[model samples]
Target: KTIIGIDPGSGIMSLTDKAMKDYDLNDWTLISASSAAMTATLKKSYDRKKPIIITGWTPHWMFSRYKLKYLDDPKQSYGSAEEIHTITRKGFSKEQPNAAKLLSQFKWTQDEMGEIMIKVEEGEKPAKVAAEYVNKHKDQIAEWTKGVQKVKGDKINLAYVAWDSEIASTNVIGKVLEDLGYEVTLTQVEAGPMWTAIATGSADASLSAWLPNTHKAYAAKYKGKYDDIGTSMTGVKMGLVVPQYMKNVNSIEDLKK
Candidate 1:
């Protein structure tokens, strides 16, 4: 059987590759597809009540949509739990202090972010989903906007990898910036380029900085160049996932069967 995965450039792709080797899944083929493609395949399989294996992560809509579980990684091949952070260009704070501070203060939990992801997955426009969230979360928005004043259409660019999780946050932050009177533009790219865009000052910021494990290489490659605004969410994790119906496969080790 084949294993599904997101784009080859995602940090999880590498982790999953390592998992294949660690779990000695030598006969299985890892298929690379976009996040949407992978999730679509999952939906089809789950609908048919068929078994499937795939790379999965937390703060994602897939978990909300399906009955799934992470196959225990006793080998810990996927590394420890991660944290998502907001990051910006080195001098972006000085260049656009208000927007930078707003981004820095932006934080939410898995459930809060999932509010957007689930609706977006349900076929709502991200902008609309974000707009609704903007109105719905006045207290949280106030936290991000406190001491940050509205601008007169100042420009702000955000570079993100377009994972569903990132898409949820990027659009929400973009919507907030727009409400704060900044003309926000989101630039979607691969993880490496997303980091490069911020490091080289091509993009203003990103809320997709996963660290301590998933993006270890990129974090080291551009450590001092970019600024870490702060952690947006915690208790993040990644690993092999299977539908709950697959009782025979409860862990990565079981994949050998």
Candidate 2:
């Protein structure tokens, strides 16, 4: 058997690796591809009713676009519920206090993020979709910007991975900062570079740090170099997922058969 996955460095890949070891799925190979590529593979597999497993996560558009379920991880190798956090460069708070405050206060639900991601997946520009979401949810955005003053075209660089979840969040937060009068640059990079950008101060911030487990290595490497403002979204799970129709193959261990 084979499983489709994203970047090898991604948290999902790590979880999949652990699941394989714990479940004795050494014979089931994992094929690494980009997120978009994996999505395409998933679509093809779903349409044909093929037996396919993927390293999947929540806050992703696939869950909403297709009927899918995560394989049961009885060994809990994927870890418990996780959270996506906002991490900023050192002195970001003092350099851009208003933006800092908003970053620290930013929080949303899986459904909320998933909606934006689904819109983006439907061919709408991420920035436009994010702006629409911001305009429609003024009250919530206001809460994040509460007590913070607007800026005057100050430039801010936000780095993030190309994952659908990060695309939705980075763009939304970019729009929010833009509305506050800052020139926000949303740079898409790999997982390592995303963390390195913030740690080296090249990027002002990012709301893509999946933590306590997913990004534990990056978190440890950049521990004191950056400030982990707080969790932006929570109750996340990562594992090998299959379409709901694959009823017989419901758990990681089942992959072996």
Candidate 3:
């Protein structure tokens, strides 16, 4: 069996690599596809009737438009929907309580996530630009780390989806966790693998999951398999989007035009 990682621009590459390593499978191949092409690839895979994993996210037309199921992570790789969190192997809390506290408390607005994604798409360095944004917003950052202090020498694992919206929140939270004194290793992947990375205990935690909607089914399948931190953003949404250039394509029904 061959496992292909699509949407190179999204965080899927890093995530798929982590998952493959977790499975101890070395022969899997990675393919780079543009977001547009990745979507097409997903369709092609489905047409071939082969089980495939693609870089995916919500508020996109795919989830609403297609019939798909997030593969089971019996290994508990990905956490749950919006269930992205930190997974400490050993001494994580004892070594980096401050970072852990901040992670548990970290949250964001959907719009804020979108803005960050836009910046990354515009060619900003993921970690550097995101760090600057958090530093500039000290008051908010402080709230997230309330009652927390930096650790001496702590390491943390953070996973995320490279989708534009997810990147903003993921990077912002990653910075906060780092400032709290955790040497953070951030991994990016598609929706499925993101859940797998966290659930299987291969990675500490992630902040890229959606819930009660996009990731509801996945959450149900993996309940109690991992921690349920809570919602990072409420009232978040996903759907098929189109540029105004195609006014005639007002809705899903107009896609044919």
Please list the residue runs of candidate 3 whose C-alpha ends up more than 4 Å from where it truly belongs after superposition: 1-97, 254-257
Better of 2 and 3 by TM-score: 2
Q: What is the lDDT of residue 23 in candidate 2?
A: 83
- When sorted by lDDT, best at the front, the candidate numbers are 1, 2, 3
On TM-score, the stronger of 1 and 3 is 1
lDDT, model 1: 0.88
Predicted candidate 3 versus true structure: per-residue lDDT over 45-152, tens digit per residue: 665655554544443345433565443344433333432333333334445556656766776664455556656655788888788778677788888888987776
Residues 31-71 of candidate 2 have per-residue lDDT tens digits of 97899899999989899999888888887889877899988
lDDT score for residue 152 of model 1 = 97
For each candidate, what TM-score against the reference? 0.97, 0.97, 0.63
lDDT of each: 0.88, 0.86, 0.57
lDDT of 3 at 204: 73
Candidate 2: lDDT over CA atoms? 0.86
Off by over 4 Å in 1: none
